[PDB]
Design a protein around this ligand. Structure first.
Ligand SMILES: O=C(O)c1cccnc1C(=O)O
Ligand SMILES: O=C(O)c1cccnc1C(=O)O
Ligand SMILES: O=C(O)c1cccnc1C(=O)O
Ligand SMILES: O=C(O)c1cccnc1C(=O)O
Ligand SMILES: O=C(O)c1cccnc1C(=O)O
Ligand SMILES: O=C(O)c1cccnc1C(=O)O
Lengths: 273, 273, 273, 273, 273, 273
């Protein structure tokens, strides 16, 4: 299964040489446990939790679904299996749920503020090591959309790249044959001129990086009139305070890496009996 | 070495099928880049960064050391290697430095509030999946200390476990032979009676869970008089506000999972030329 | 190295428990070997071969480059290292070069018959197990272009997918929110009505699957008329005798799986001398 | 499963970050699919395909067996499972069956032209990277026999090895002590004098490399005369037009690498219906 | 689970390219086999055996438990599965049971000689490569106890380390903050003075290395009077002959690496029908 | 490198979460260490030790070679590198050397007793899990020879197999085509009749299992007269006391699994300065 190895590694780091408790547990037995919320938020991590339980021979009796909202004291999951295994898995289970839900929850807050159905919210490649796929998945559960998953997914030319590109148009024109047939090319721009030049060069997507709303609206209006098929993306420390403003700029999407890199754990715990 | 595989996997999830840019880069060449801070903070991730650079054939010309304070616009590292590789590693390098430094920085703030050289600040087993070792290492660079690293490091018995133990003293006495000779046993207690009882039962360490400063002080005073070599730990939603007051209870340590699960990325970026 | 693992596994399956010759070679010594052609074709596998020698401690004294033409008796590579190691890697080296060159060479012939700079030759996801990246790379060295690398690279919908779909336009308009921001959506069509239907649905790419030049040209002219930004791809048993004809249907690309699944080894061998 | 890892890796290289279709499929459901032929040939890959479906949770309702002949339009397999999973494994399934069957089919033709039960058809160590075991297995399903599986399986010495050797008889008499007790030693010979030399040296097998039938027959008659227990193998560009002739030289086996390195995919496809 | 990978690798080294017998087995079929002892001893390896059987699809009908005594001709296990698999697993199954039981048996003999329920018998970090966890587990089944499991479990300072420590007390005092909160520190001492000094410096455990019984007694008596909670361990070529005398010195434990490094295979075999 | 992964895993199990000492080492520095013998024996493990040192960045200044004899107090290796790394590697280095040398030494004792240059000493497939290749290598350094390395190396039909083989001759005759061309077939026999039947059936090798010397001589004499090309092997709890007797039986080789499964650690240690 696609994420099985991920769960194996998550567990392995916690068990190390082997759980010490099972060495002294006088008698193992079947038991039921509940994952309860101690804070409100939106649920994420279901796909991983279920794969983890199945892998460890733990039964998932009941569980709320990804994207579902919850309140403190709410029971999020009911699991049953060997007492020794419920304990060996406890932390790994909670940590992945609290982290995933943390991202989904923070993300849902940005979805509300953005308040739009025409403009999608996006993440970035700023993700914690080994957690890209995990965290991208978590953003989906917050109600937003994902940007590319890696460096093979699409071509994104930013400031650093552009400095070594004499004549963008020529570059983009002859880059197509060396890129996979289905690849889009995005160009990071920091001024109306740059974006305009990007569009004329043959950019599939143009990012309006660190630009005022006015500056962005100008570029969006220009795009609508001359390059109707170029997607526009706004980004650059966009906050909960300014996200709505940019939603009205005319851009197609808005990316904020904070959805992932400023997310924190939603409080939860596991209780027996 | 110990963390090479970690870096390989971190990089692998970003490269996927293969970096697209290197497919169109007309000509590769050696270049120098600098990792610059965009916020104030304490550096962390040095050990991982250097291994990452060495693995990819990138030279580390200069770098500040783990634990060093830095300010915005400060050059954290200077590296040199193939342009294509610098770009292929950039995000992986920045993500691990921003995450690790975020933890160290938040941690350094609790250390400040703690304001004590006798009491130790500790993390918890609440870490992000696959990042146990990474994050525990980050807490150290913040100036705090680590709690156990896993379920194999020490035995920690709490409510969940205790509910199934008839005679705690008997259990601990006969548990030593089935545990590695060097392991310590910690008992989580929610009352003075419980703490006192755990000490008599033979606990090496007692956790004063969710107790007031006064409550904790009473336990510490009892420990000092009757079980001088038993270690005391305070925990349970300790904040930057209450942390100092707890440092005066007489407890030996104070654990706060938030050091890791409430930490966020410190802002940085990489610049060429 | 992104392909380092690939090479370890290739070498491992041939050495098994361990090479038997090294068990009897009384004295090892530094030696030189040459990789010569016994056929003519285009070279491919340079990237993998160099990493292979690097890994095994063999020195690459000289080597022609990928894409370079060669003919019988040509010395393609000169290598030097321990005699035992040269024999242990011999077969692994030749097999990947002969297989890679085989694909590039067969690909270059289709490149000719195509004879065009306005039309791109594309491969397919029809590749040998565990050799995708290896074979897509081999095609490039043949002068052609690669199609997507996998199922994560882009969304390719065919009747199978749309079978249980009734409003293509709405279906795609919603897929966008759930697909990564940079992903293109291609639709396979076996009739004019389908292509025309796709373009109106909002497809980024339309495949003219198993259709006549007249049928293709019909779709092209239509595309040229109303949807100029919709790439068109022709495929379906395109042969080395009909590729040129389709290149004149006004299609942007022509994909042929045969480039990979019909390629065969190019005769080569290694001599000590 | 001995080949379980092989299948995980084959599937992994196609899914990459994750299949994009499952991201948009609003509702998954159980479905059935058929693997049909578009050509005729001998089936191969049964073993790998079953393990593949097992791994992915797809049910194999019906399937022809390895070695079984088939013709265009024949339904080779009937499978059932989640719609999303059938699409995710489709290509991986077909590629291995088409590639495996391709080798078995080409192998069966050489089996005919050979037309003999006293002579064995053998493959070579010339196989595609990472596919040795897979391709040797494929040859068997073609009706032929496998040669050694690797360099650990047996000792095969050629001029390259003996170049710096002056007493074959003593050299081999000593190799025995250093080789595993059960290993056979084969020697490649390009002249009568060499074969005659090998047999006297104590070789278990002699290869008649790139020699005429008359030359081969000379060595055979000699073998039949003094060394009846020395297997003889003929090889060296043996073609589908000269294989039968060599089979009459009194040789025990004829190896032809082309069985694998010249085989190509057999046209097949998958339909839902 | 925790040891599945271990069993996979154990099996993989025996199967290599693939079991030859299954290539000629005319027809496979279900069969029952018994693992029988050919010597007297204490059973060990149950946990590994069961995981091994489950992994390979073999049913465990019956089995004695770890720690149980057995005699020659005793049936240790009864299993059922495919004939081919039983043969493919036989050696792997027997090797791990004979090795593990050999350790448990030798261990049970030192336990007998020790003749005490207050003193613990311990192993060491002297284990065979890749078998640390396997062998530590085997010692337990012999009735003894385990020492630390690795270099991460506890801190052990001996001659090599001490030679570079100016002030031992200072070092230990300031080392606590840099070690996991739960770790114990053991000091290896070669004299009464050293032991006494280590106790004053703050050692959690003191090893009485290569000291006479009288010497060890003096240290134990000192510990009892001044450092009651410091743990004492005796070691250094302790034999079956001297072990009992040491158990009377007052020390808490006695470690002997020989339990593992001088253990040998207990004789067993597998029978069909 | 073929055994690199083996060493990585050996180290990994000892380091676990990470060496605790390096956490408190005030200052690292370069240092020299010596591996000294504390008991006489024959050296084995060189190949692994060197690969281990190179992997950990430790320099091997001096080292005796595999097969070389040593006496107590003798310095076997002189290594230099970071103090922290010499300590992290110490146990892994010693354990592999003491175990390998232990096997080589025990083996050399059997070589002497056998006292022959015409009869080779052999091992079996009775090896500790994960150590087959390691232990087979160790036997070579004792002065003996190896039997097959696994189940793919050769075909060995024993009692269990034979029970399901009606008509051996027919079986062996038609098994050749389904086995790799170079494979030998050995048959385990427990009586003159069985061996005779084995020879007539077409056995490449015949094992004289659990037979008296007389019984074996009879079979050897029969072999010399009728099947001069069949190799003979004696086995069945052959000891140091009876090995010489069997050497005079006329058999080609003698196998004793004890060379490996009854071997124990040769005492050694590491000293600084
Ligand atoms: O590279 C990306 O995918 C990306 C996309 C949008 C915004 N930022 C980034 C970034 O990480 O720099
Ligand atoms: O288990 C631990 O290591 C731990 C130690 C201190 C505080 N909390 C925990 C926890 O994760 O529950
Ligand atoms: O899915 C693909 O990548 C693909 C692209 C072009 C032609 N065929 C295919 C196919 O294998 O169905
Ligand atoms: O080495 C082999 O296995 C082999 C066996 C038969 C024919 N050729 C070869 C070869 O690749 O050189
Ligand atoms: O390091 C250990 O764990 C250890 C513990 C007790 C006795 N010896 C050792 C040793 O291997 O040196
Ligand atoms: O199987 C073997 O290789 C083998 C060879 C000789 C003696 N015993 C065995 C055995 O392990 O049963």
């Amino acid at each position: 299964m696609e994420i099985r190895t991920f769960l194996e590694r998550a567990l392995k780091e916690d068990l190390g040489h082997g759980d010490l408790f099972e060495r002294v547990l006088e008698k193992d037995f079947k038991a039921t446990a509940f994952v309860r919320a101690k804070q409100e938020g939106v649920f994420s991590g279901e796909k991983y939790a279920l794969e983890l339980l199945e892998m460890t021979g733990i039964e998932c009796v009941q569980t709320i679904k990804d994207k579902e909202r919850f309140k403190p004291k709410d029971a999020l999951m009911e699991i049953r299996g060997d007492f020794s295994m419920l304990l060996k898995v406890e932390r790994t289970l909670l940590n992945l749920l609290q982290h995933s839900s943390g991202i989904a929850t923070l993300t849902s807050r940005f979805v509300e503020a953005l308040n739009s159905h025409k403009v999608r919210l996006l993440d970035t490649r700023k993700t914690r090591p080994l957690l890209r796929i995990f965290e991208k998945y978590s953003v989906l559960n917050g109600g937003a959309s994902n940007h590319r998953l890696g460096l093979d997914d699409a071509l994104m030319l930013k400031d650093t790249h552009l400095r070594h590109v004499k004549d963008l148009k020529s570059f983009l024109t002859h880059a197509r044959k060396n890129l996979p047939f289905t690849a889009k090319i995005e160009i990071e721009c920091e001024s109306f001129e740059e974006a305009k030049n990007a569009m004329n060069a043959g950019a599939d997507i143009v990012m309006c990086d660190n630009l005022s709303v006015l500056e962005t609206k100008e570029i969006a209006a220009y795009r609508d009139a001359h390059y109707p098929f170029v997607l526009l993306e706004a980004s650059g420390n966009i906050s909960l305070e300014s996200i709505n403003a940019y939603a009205k700029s005319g851009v197609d999407a808005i990316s904020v890496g904070a959805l992932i890199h400023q997310a924190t754990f939603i409080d939860m715990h596991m209780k027996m009996a």
